[PDB]
Design a protein around this nucleic acid. Sequence first.
RNA 1: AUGUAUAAAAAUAGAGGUAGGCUACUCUCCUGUAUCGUAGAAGAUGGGCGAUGGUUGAUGAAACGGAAGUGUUUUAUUGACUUGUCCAUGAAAUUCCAUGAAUCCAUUGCAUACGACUUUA
RNA 2: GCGAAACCACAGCCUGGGGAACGGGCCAGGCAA
RNA 3: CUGCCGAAGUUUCCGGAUAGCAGAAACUCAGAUCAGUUUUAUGUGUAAAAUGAGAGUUUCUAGUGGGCCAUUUUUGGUAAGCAGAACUGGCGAUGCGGGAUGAACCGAACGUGAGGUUAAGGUGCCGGAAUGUACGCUCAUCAGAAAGGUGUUAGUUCAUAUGAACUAGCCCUGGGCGCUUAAGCGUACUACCCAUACCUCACCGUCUGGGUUAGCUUUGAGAAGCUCAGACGAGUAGGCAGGCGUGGAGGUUUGUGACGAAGCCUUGGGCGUGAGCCUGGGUCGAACAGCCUCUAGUGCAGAUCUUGGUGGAAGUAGC
RNA 4: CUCUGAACCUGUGGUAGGUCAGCAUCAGUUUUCGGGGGCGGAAAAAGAAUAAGGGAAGGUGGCUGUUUAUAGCCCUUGUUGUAAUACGUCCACUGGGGACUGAGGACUGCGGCUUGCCAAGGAUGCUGACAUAAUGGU
Lengths: 97, 150, 124, 168, 106, 181
Amino acid sequence: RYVIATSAPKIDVSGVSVEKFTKAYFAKQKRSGPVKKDEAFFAENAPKNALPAERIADQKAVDAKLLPAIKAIPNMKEYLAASFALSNGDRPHLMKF
Amino acid sequence: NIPPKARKIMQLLRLLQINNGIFVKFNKAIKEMLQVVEPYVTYGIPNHKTVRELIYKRGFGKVNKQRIPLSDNAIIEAALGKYSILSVEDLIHEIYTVGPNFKQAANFLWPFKLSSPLGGWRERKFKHFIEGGDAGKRDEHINGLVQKML
Amino acid sequence: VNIIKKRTKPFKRHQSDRFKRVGESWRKPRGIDSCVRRRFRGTISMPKIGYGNNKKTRYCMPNGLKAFLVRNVSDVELLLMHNKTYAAEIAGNVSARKRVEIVEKARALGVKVTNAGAKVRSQE
Amino acid sequence: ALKEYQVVGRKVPTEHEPVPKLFRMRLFAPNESVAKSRYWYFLKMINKVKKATGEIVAINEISEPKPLKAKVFGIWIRYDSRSGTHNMYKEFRDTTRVGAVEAMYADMAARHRARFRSIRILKVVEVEKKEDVRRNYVKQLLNPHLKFPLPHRRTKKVFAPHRPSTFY
Amino acid sequence: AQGHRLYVKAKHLSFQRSKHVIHPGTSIVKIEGCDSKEEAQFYLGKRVCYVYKSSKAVRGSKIRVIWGTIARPHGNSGAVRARFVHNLPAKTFGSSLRVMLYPSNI
Amino acid sequence: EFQKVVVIDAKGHLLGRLASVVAKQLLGGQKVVVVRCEELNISGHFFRNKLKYLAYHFRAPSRIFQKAVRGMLPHKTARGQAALEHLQAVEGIPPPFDKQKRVVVPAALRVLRLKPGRKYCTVGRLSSEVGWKYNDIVAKLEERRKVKSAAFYQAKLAKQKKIASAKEASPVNQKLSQFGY
RNA sequence: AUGUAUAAAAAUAGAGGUAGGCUACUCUCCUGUAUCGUAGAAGAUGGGCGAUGGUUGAUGAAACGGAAGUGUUUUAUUGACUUGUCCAUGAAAUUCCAUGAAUCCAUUGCAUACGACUUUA
RNA sequence: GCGAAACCACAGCCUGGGGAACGGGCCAGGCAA
RNA sequence: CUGCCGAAGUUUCCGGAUAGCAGAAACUCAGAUCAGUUUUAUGUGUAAAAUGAGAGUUUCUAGUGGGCCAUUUUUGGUAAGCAGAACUGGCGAUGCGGGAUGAACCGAACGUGAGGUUAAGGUGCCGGAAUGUACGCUCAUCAGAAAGGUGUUAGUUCAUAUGAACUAGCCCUGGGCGCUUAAGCGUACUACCCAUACCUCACCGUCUGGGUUAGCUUUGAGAAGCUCAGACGAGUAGGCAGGCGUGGAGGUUUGUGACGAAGCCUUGGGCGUGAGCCUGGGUCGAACAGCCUCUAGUGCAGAUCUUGGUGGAAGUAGC
RNA sequence: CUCUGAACCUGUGGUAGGUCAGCAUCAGUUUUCGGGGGCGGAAAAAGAAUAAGGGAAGGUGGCUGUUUAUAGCCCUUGUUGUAAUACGUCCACUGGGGACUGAGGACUGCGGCUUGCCAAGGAUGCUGACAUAAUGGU
């Protein structure tokens, strides 16, 4: 619902392994990791959930399987780079996206 | 401000409320009967769809003097089993074809409480239908009207 | 079955705002030519049985509990088996001495006390 | 949405009148029910036959046999005024007989404030001969030199930036 | 500052009302570029919002937004009927309402 | 399309129709400025409108146009009072607005509303003999501004011609003409 | 606030432009869904290439603009930027929406319901 | 300096129409500082 | 304080007894009778088919026991209007949408709410809704929302392309702003706006019809309980019912209270449709309350009410 | 011997209480765009197509007059055909958009799919954020 379906020329995405992408992979980390009742005081237990490398390595593989795909289509790489916006007198119904 | 003679006639027809609707057996006595209530009712010939659709969507029985919806075939046969009416199709057939038990079948259906029509009536409503209003006889034009109140 | 009310605002007496000898307690206006009694536009409402709330929700606090007035510590004990529907209201004249006895007993019993922090003071 | 409905009716047969005569006339009604009611009123005026005394036998609508070919239609009408007794006959050029009829009703309803009940359609005929045409305006529409600019041009998108050209 | 504005500007006209009786539960909104009832079908269901500022600094910011949802069209000129979580104040007549493009059906 | 500030030229516009569209726009929280109000037009010949004013006291059409709107808006309501100040009616085209675009209202244009051969009255001509005594100076400013504007237009036209020739000379133009640009 | 973008006059029942020597021309209109601008971690780091132009900021003022000119250009130089054509990194687990004069005062009669007024001081 | 009584639903621009007075309240109006 | 029922508003004889309306009870029946009903047919009445509704009695007892308006009917009128009787409805006991506003006009008759759609009336602005489409007519130099016209518009008819006589419409003469091939009129067809109305659902109550015990591990026997279904909801006079509150009285809570009773104020929090209630804080300082019954000097906005207090008038009349 | 989920270490094991937004699959009430079709109408009328004839025109060619020419039209048949469209009506035909509701609280019943399962006797899932402020009230 929060995505506008654009009629841009379709890009082959068959190459990337999409099966590993599941609800568990995108699940938010469980509210876990109990701490002993002395470190909560003085605020000396704060960890960081910094993005794991394999999450990037997953994406770098995805980039390695989609970045080669996209440059072949002319202006596609720049088209994704550009940021969508509306000018004055813009009627979303009239101009199909 | 309904005339007293008109109100007695129309209570006899169980049209106690505005935008109500009942089935009437057309006969020689009916024409001169509803002459008094011509500016207060409209009527016409309903096709099988209108007869079917009213009983399905808005057909409520009269079981122990209660407005009991007809959403199961057991209700009709419990009340109209003696007249070989055993399901909704038979009720439609007893109404549409006007069988021997039309008097009992008609009384069993509670007066259909229709709604204000989709799109409303004509610009003016309380004149004769032939005179641009929506009162009085309209023949096969009733079906278009019921499909606005269904 | 959630705690939903057909109206929040109270019913004030007609013309009770203008006068001070006139109390805000709702009194039925019996005036023969009273247009406000006659239900005109721009007037006030009037209590009707149509304003009653759900019979499974009448007497229910916004959190779903029905207030129950406990005088002494004996009363707080009988709410042992209705702690999910009733809340131990502590009477207004119960002294601070028995007020703690009521709150400590009710805490272990599992019941909810509505005015558990009145006249008392915590100490760590 | 007027449409030309043919109506045929006859009185109820009885031992006194075993075979009733067939009365048929073409009248313009927006629906079948209006046509039948108008036919009974016409017969009461002329033959004095009640609705119960008679019955309709056939109702049928008539399309324009050549709706794509322009024609001229002359209608004779009797209209009710303050005196309650008036007669008129008018001519119109249109491609459909119903189109001519609804055109006259608007003209009657404008010039004389004429109601549907008051108007009774007396005669309908097709004008074909050039010499048959009598009215001046249709005469001007008959000569082959019909050429003139479009009248009433006047052509929510409010606040148009430029001044409208309103020309060719 | 070309960019941003993933929404469509709209103006809050008034309430749903008779000649003398007003029901403030629903409000009339005239969306730009909408000029027919058949066209307003596209905007049925979108999320409209009223954005205003205030002196108090709440959560470190100064912006308060009253969300809403377009429900049905209103007449032949592209007006729509929008219901908000809080009924709009009667002072905001003739203001700006931002009709963002979600929930998108396209 | 609506703007924070809108300039509307009153030449060749009906008073009532112009009053209606601005009345709705003013209630819409929009600032509207009306110029050349002296050139507004009212259906009916000159004598009839003269008799209308004689029965009726502000001589300025800018005030008269404002007065017509004032009774055409909820003046008693404080919302109507606030919306009144957002409307600025001035005679001629003042320098603060001469260098800005002047849009027109189709629903008020005489050519789109008046039958040919129908008499009409001009407010500035009508006001000339009722107390207004500034027609010459107002007119004198009009030719002075339009002469300067015409010279500006010629320079803009020459610039437009040069860039149009440059645009056609550009091979990029017809490279992707399939888009209609 | 969200591009907070846009200047002819004038006919409209003919206008405008275009070109020729007011007289003979031609072309466009029939709107703005037009035109301009809108490409980058709000638009990054650099490498270029390519313009070697463009975009502007900063100040140094020149003219124009009486009306309400307070803004339009002209620029002078400098500072950057430049997605104009391209690259390489980079930008994220928030891992589905919520974001100093004057008055009183004194003088003062030129006044005078009373102030005011009236010069002087 | 010493000091009332009467009175008091509440008020107080009109213009007209508002059918029963309506102006002192209602609607159209202007006014309204 | 809430809930239910709720007239009559007048015949008829004669201050009344009747009646009638509304109830309240007792009866007998739905296989019995009915109907401000309609037909059929016999001579408008009468008698015997449909459409509906269960229908009929007896007893005893509150209130009314006026009108206004409108429709109509007549008779006369009588300057002319009109008047006089009637006739039947509506208001009166009744709010809401519309009619600029307005008690009689157009709609629609009312529990609290959500959505939907409408009636009457409306879509230029104020004003919610098309500055809709098609077609004409209106030019007013007072529009508009008896007649005359060197007044037009369409014309007709008759005379020989022109006139005359005419046909009719409209103008001239005799809610605001504005509107003028309308935002005027007239017709037609689309679309839209909205009522306490119509539909669907939720909820409160009322009435009606059920179900429920060898009380079955569904446990739901305060049988005065629990449960199920449907329709319904204006209200004066008046009738019926259930409750809230005050002082005191017998019983009771093995009730509360100097760790603060009663009271009082307070934009603290709650509960109940409501009468009312419970509680937090501040003052306060010696008593008080819930429940079942008993009981009465028991509930206030009025009485030119009694008593006390206090203002404006007013620093006024003034001394 | 069991038990005390008994106290602690041991678990960093497993599930996580209200308020408010989000989407989804459903249900009731709806409003709005569609698509595909059946039957009926002069079996639309037309029209195109279609072999002619005749006719006159506001007359082409010839010359106002004229009759298909160096334009043709109209009418009449003929004409494919069971044309198609439109209109009217039906579908227990189908595909989307949006809003408002969740009353009830084991089990029954009535249906369909095939004991089980289901859109069939009324809402359940996936998630989040807020909470340590949001939602709220005065």
